[PDB]
Design a protein around this ligand. Structure first.
Ligand SMILES: Nc1ncnc2c1ncn2[C@@H]1O[C@H](COP(=O)(O)OP(=O)(O)O)[C@@H](O)[C@H]1O
Ligand SMILES: [Mg+2]
Ligand SMILES: [Mg+2]
Ligand SMILES: [Mg+2]
Lengths: 454, 454, 427, 426, 123, 123
């Protein structure tokens, strides 16, 4: 009735079994009751006090853990390492020779028995593969009609009209790379095309990635995971977009290059780029075939000014009754007039708006203005400061609403705030302003005035 | 009788029990007096010299203890990390399978048997970095009304008018960052505004953190516990304020952005920074949604120096009757004239007050007075030193009161000991001086004379 | 009967041998059935209840594994280092004493037995060199009539007619240099010739090397891997073709020169290199055996433009319903006539088509036109932008069929995206 | 008759107890003569080949030591932590359940049977905290008047005039740090200021400490004990001085910072630091609030060196008969003349006075003299060696006194005993 | 007559002795020749298959080396530390309980029986 | 024929040899043919079921290599440091007790038997 246990290590044609038990690898004459085939390399076996097996059973469920490094060329042996970087070679259990082995996983081993019994799974859930539901639509974007229609043609049409591309044998673009001065709104349309796709379903899926998010193991882990998740979410027949913001994190590139060249195995996914620096990106990405379509986003002009302001300056916000009486209580007409006035003033070439003095290679001097270095984020800050001044005035004085003078003060103030604040210069802006004359620059200063690093 | 002791692993239909005993596994037969199902999995049991179970008792209460990492799929196995990162998989205990299992706990185990027995409770002391009564008030800072109003706009206004922002659809900024040369008042403005808003409850918190102690239970876990405490205290509905003094500890920056974006949903939490250096801060922090307003604290000018002197030389200190007779019983005007005299000598552009000579790369030179290298801490260090000189004058003469000559000597002294101290300097000083002159600096000379590195 | 196992130490002439078992070393006799000399030093053996060796077996295949630090001068012992900085002197197995012993190997060791068993080597398996199949032959190559047959003579002919070259005793040009403006089919002709050789074994090793791939130790080990792989690939005698891309980044030079000189002596190796910037090409790479044929690829003329446009404008694409009546259902005639019209539009020397004005030292403002600055990539941009405009048109009107006016508008839209010369200014 | 040994585990009502023996746990019935109540959980017991408890015994006095981490709610188990952080849960011996068990204590435990056996007192002589009455006055210190006045202002003026500082709202400093070249009277200035403040009481303490003593039981315990003793000795209101000579050895630092920040509330405490390397000190210590006042003591100049030589040579100097005639035998002026001539000689820019050479990184070579490498300790050494060599000479000749060349010989031997690219001594 | 070895731990006046051998400490009878005073505390002793101490010799001279931490108040047991930071309380040899014992010394120890032998000199 | 192995530590005038075997230390009688004076110390020797020394074998050639720290003045004791900073005193070898050894050399020792065997040359 009492009985010990052992683990099989080898078998012979003579129906004799090698068993590890009592810390010793003995050879045993198996009982004729059981067969010679159901015995498994790594199978626990009962033993009698006469030291003879009477049963072949299950596999060990508890023991030392290790990480698999290599499967030996023979195929029956695995080279693994332990807790304190102790490394050993073991054999494999029959279940190991319910998923197949992937070198780099974890195994359950008994070092004294020298046998691995089970691939033990360790899983960590990553939030990067989690999709994102975009929030802002094209009604929140202004002064980008040409570029928004370009992105419409280059992104939403292939998903909506795959069959038209098929019958015309036109390969849809695979990589779109936006570029523009910082604060123009690249991210806005980049994450609003996903809303456009979601609304254009007569199930869109977006997955955002940030450079600082993937600038920290190392970063190359998540690229394969996100690409595979996109491949899975695309093979089901649904549109999907992977978005890479701030390509400046890239120049590692070659793995991404290989993956994007393999992306041609898929036909309903586009990687969308975005950057403030065209130069700093690795040009191999920009080579046609991987990232083909380029779209420039421009600093808003005078026309785009009132258009983008109207987006922030809705009729919802309170306005002082004097302004309403100025146009007989017509909110639309009065707000249109005031936004026209403020965009004219901010785009006017008054002495306050004087920003930059250029020192060309031939010494040509021009007094530039903030109206030439404007951006969307500047408009956001301006309207925010206008609202803050208006609410302070309402609190202190009592009358509610908004007035033009608030914006007039905010616009003249905010230039000083952003003067010391960074992103006030860009090499592309210098190149664009110098293209008219064709002369380099070595001296830059503002016009309150501060120097610039050139 | 001489009886052994083992631990049960699992039962069997044949009324046979697997038991770990003598350091190895065996299979035995229980007594007919006991029921096999009555045995509990992973329970101690006694034996007889005939190797037969007679009865079983409670679970072993001592032995090894490991750290719970995860619970396996079927629930009868757990994966636990050892003392020296010695990971092993073990079975569970029947009482362990109300007070359920939670990953991250500890388990009483025996390595050889591989059977957990208990989950001991452990306690951790709270970090005690909590609210402090804000001692400094607005009336204790001089010559910063611009920054006073800026911080009040950014922090004080929102909670007083929570619904007013929703009236104008203004998203309140959360990250308010301070900076400026050392010894200017940044550490005090945060406490002052906390005191103001607390007094504005006619029921508010504050969480000071300094740079050193977060270089010293793990730093990431420390920040995590600070942030969860802040969020759960803000959940009460009252406004709360967080304050990372000396963000030069932050550049493991990554996690911090994650918690800031998490608390972005919260409506009553603020992140407030402080630093003498803007460069060493991680630029990823300086983006909208994260730290928004880059309020700059500047070395006080002549008027602000007069104010901050007036914040110390109050009319409630012993004033010498000699100068008092010059003003006929009015201590206020006497100490006022004291203040103008001392500030005039302090900011005087005389040869004594020459501090630095700035030699630029072009070769030009610029003599610098202490007025441009002043600070807010030096005013403390000179007023208190003058008071100490008054004490020693009283000791050596017996005449009480304070005289102008004390501060007159104190100014030249404070310049004397700090002649070897570049603590008044900051990279922004060189940058702004080069911008003002238009030439990059190459050499530094003070007027003893020293050449601090360029 | 039940029995254990032991590990041999060293034999003795008295029908006995030292053997380690049960955690200690004994001296045991062996059965007369076996010969002690036949037993290998370190061969695992079986025992008995009487504690006597019965027969041999196989060497233990599992245990600890250690980095062989060095081999002792005795020729049968060696010092190895364990995982925990432990250093042990151990014996050596008979198979270990023909892949010789070198420092840094990984050896199988049992600490109790103190015996090395087997040198498990690391498997440095990499795919920095791979075989890739061609995509399209010259059948889709447009406007390169005279640029393909000489390539066929250069590389395709020598393998098929080796006897003629043996009679001539003439070495085929192992390298042909390709250069010109970007987007002129430099890779396309290489792919075409690779496909043609892949259709002429009625068995083709093609290797592609990229400049970024070279930029991936330093470049020496990489390029050595590619060149040696080419060596064993050409060893079999199967025709081998190698390609190199945009060598402007290259020319280190001497190591590449030595490698290509070494591979020059090989018989059936052919390598073709192409690069855009001919001017910055080092003449040293042009030495005999290397690339000696320099073929200039230039911007297409009217007929080459016709051919290349017809290559992408196959009759399998829809044609405007209204314009079908003009050609009476002849879709091919409509397509070719419209291609003629569009090619004339690009090649029209009108104010619209002006590209660049350059003032030389002689005061001439030579007006450049897109007909002088056309390329295959530019043509592809033309055709696919026109096709996208046609898709938008049919979407907004519901009438299928590619219309010429869409191509005409594409022509104007597409051109806003891309004596010694002294002044340059685009028009 | 031979008998083994085991460890008791628990007790049972049926004349049976569990025993750990030979590495395994068993259940055994004790001999009837012994009583179960007598046996204590964890008491070593005597076994036999019959496997029966025959009589009780002592408790184990060997094994491993593990630091207690927590005491469980069961009142019989304490989660202990091993040598290399191998925590275990063990029973507690009855003598451990008078003195009480506390977190952080050291216990004697056996990993084999998991039973704690006793606590271990980890103590020391604790004589480092023994305050020393100062024995050096300001008169023994010379050439440091600039430092004398300011250290006087820093230290005793707040103590003697706490109220006077009070009506001026001036918060007195807490930390005073001293720094300079080695052997510059730092310990002397500390002892002297202690003596001065001791005289100005009409029960102070000078807890003089040395650095390398702290590296030796654990440093944290010493730095805590000294400061609790300072707190209890300052609770009376008498002035207390806490002095850490050679502070450079430290940089634990965070414990010291937290402790001084906590204890600054007490108004009659002053900390004094001395070191040879300002840079090697952790910056947080020098932050205002902790170390308010900083003082530099530099190498003496010619006047200060003359003062020091006057300190070591009073009017009681035995002089040679040769020197008696020239100065009319007036020692009060003869010693002054000798000091003047020696300070003129040693400070002279002789090639024999070269000590170090400096090669600036901009191609400039400059040589340093003896004067920039003169310290009070070096003056002490040269004066003492001149005196002993004068004694040797007058014993080997017969005519007693002191001669000028003796110290000139003493000068050379003791002295013999932009960026910079290369340095050399000469 | 084969014979093993053991190490003394404590003595008893009942003609019996406490000796650690074969990885276990046990009480054994004593041969008539030896005496409690004759046997030396913490000394190697010859054993027998009959499990009885017969001959006590000189102290064994090789083993581990542990740097002494401190000497506990009782004076019979001292705290020493090991190479891997382990610390153990061990009994002292009679020569260690003349050249005095001070903290900071290296002692020859046999941690199996927790007995220190002598203060090894260092160069 | 089935015979064991042991290592010879010390000799006795009583014509009995100290030997370590089976994870312990015992002293045993030798075969009458061999003589203790002829029996040089240190050589591993063959045993029997009767636990009697039968023949004097050769030296050890496989063990643990460790850098010597110091040779003690008495000459038969050597302090040596192992892999994990462990420091222990061991005996010496017949060749070691004529080639010249230096501190810091690599000596082949076996920890339990505490006997050094030979200095392995370095590269
Ligand atoms: N004869 C041709 N027929 C079709 N397409 C061509 C032809 N010549 C050039 N092209 C186009 O120009 C591009 C040439 O690419 P490649 O051969 O790699 O040279 P490059 O690197 O200079 O662009 C291809 O994308 C192809 O579409
Ligand atoms: Mg953006
Ligand atoms: Mg501050
Ligand atoms: Mg090409």
């Amino acid at each position: 009735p009492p009985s010990g246990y052992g683990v099989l290590l080898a078998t012979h044609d003579d129906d004799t079994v090698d068993v590890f038990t009592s810390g010793r690898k003995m050879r045993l004459t198996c009982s004729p009751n059981i067969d010679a085939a159901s015995l498994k390399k790594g199978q626990t076996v009962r033993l009698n006090e006469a030291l003879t097996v009477v049963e072949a059973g299950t596999f060990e469920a508890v023991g030392e853990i290790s990480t698999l490094r290599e499967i030996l060329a023979d195929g029956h042996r695995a080279l693994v390492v332990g807790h304190a970087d102790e490394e050993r070679v073991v054999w494999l259990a029959d279940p190991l020779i319910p998923r197949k082995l992937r070198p780099g996983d974890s195994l359950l081993v008994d070092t004294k028995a020298g046998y691995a019994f089970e691939r033990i799974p360790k899983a960590e859930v990553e939030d990067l593969v989690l999709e994102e539901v975009p929030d802002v639509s094209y009604a929140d974007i202004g002064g980008l009609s040409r570029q928004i229609e370009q992105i419409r043609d280059a992104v939403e049409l292939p998903f909506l009209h795959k069959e038209l591309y098929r019958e015309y044998s036109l390969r849809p673009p695979k990589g779109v790379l936006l570029y523009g001065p910082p604060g123009c709104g690249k991210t806005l349309i980049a994450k609003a095309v996903a809303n456009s796709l979601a609304k254009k379903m007569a199930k869109s899926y977006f997955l955002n990635i940030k450079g600082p998010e993937l600038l920290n193991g190392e970063t190359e882990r998540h690229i394969r995971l996100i690409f595979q998740r996109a491949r899975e979410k695309a093979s089901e027949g649904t549109p999907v977009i992977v978005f890479f913001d701030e390509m400046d994190s890239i120049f590692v590139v070659p793995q991404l290059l290989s993956e994007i060249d393999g992306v041609e195995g898929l036909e309903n996914v586009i990687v969308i780029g975005a950057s403030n620096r065209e130069d700093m990106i690795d040009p191999a990405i920009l080579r046609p075939g991987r990232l083909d379509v380029k779209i420039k986003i421009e600093r808003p002009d005078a026309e785009a000014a009132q258009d983008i302001y109207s987006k922030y300056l809705t009729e919802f916000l309170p306005v002082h009754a004097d302004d309403l009486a100025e146009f007989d209580g017509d909110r639309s007409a009065c707000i249109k007039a005031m936004i026209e006035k403020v965009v004219d003033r901010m785009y006017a070439e008054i002495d306050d708006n004087r920003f930059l003095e250029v020192t060309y290679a031939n010494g040509d001097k021009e007094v530039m203005y903030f109206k030439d270095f404007n951006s969307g984020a500047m408009i956001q800050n301006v309207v925010d400061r206008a609202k803050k001044n208006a609410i302070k005035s309402v609190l202190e004085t009592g009358q509610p609403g908004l007035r033009i003078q608030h914006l007039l003060d905010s616009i003249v103030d905010e230039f000083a705030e952003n003067e010391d604040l960074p992103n006030t210069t860009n090499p592309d802006d210098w190149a664009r302003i110098s293209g008219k004359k064709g002369e380099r620059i070595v001296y830059i200063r503002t016009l309150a005035s501060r120097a610039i690093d050139t």
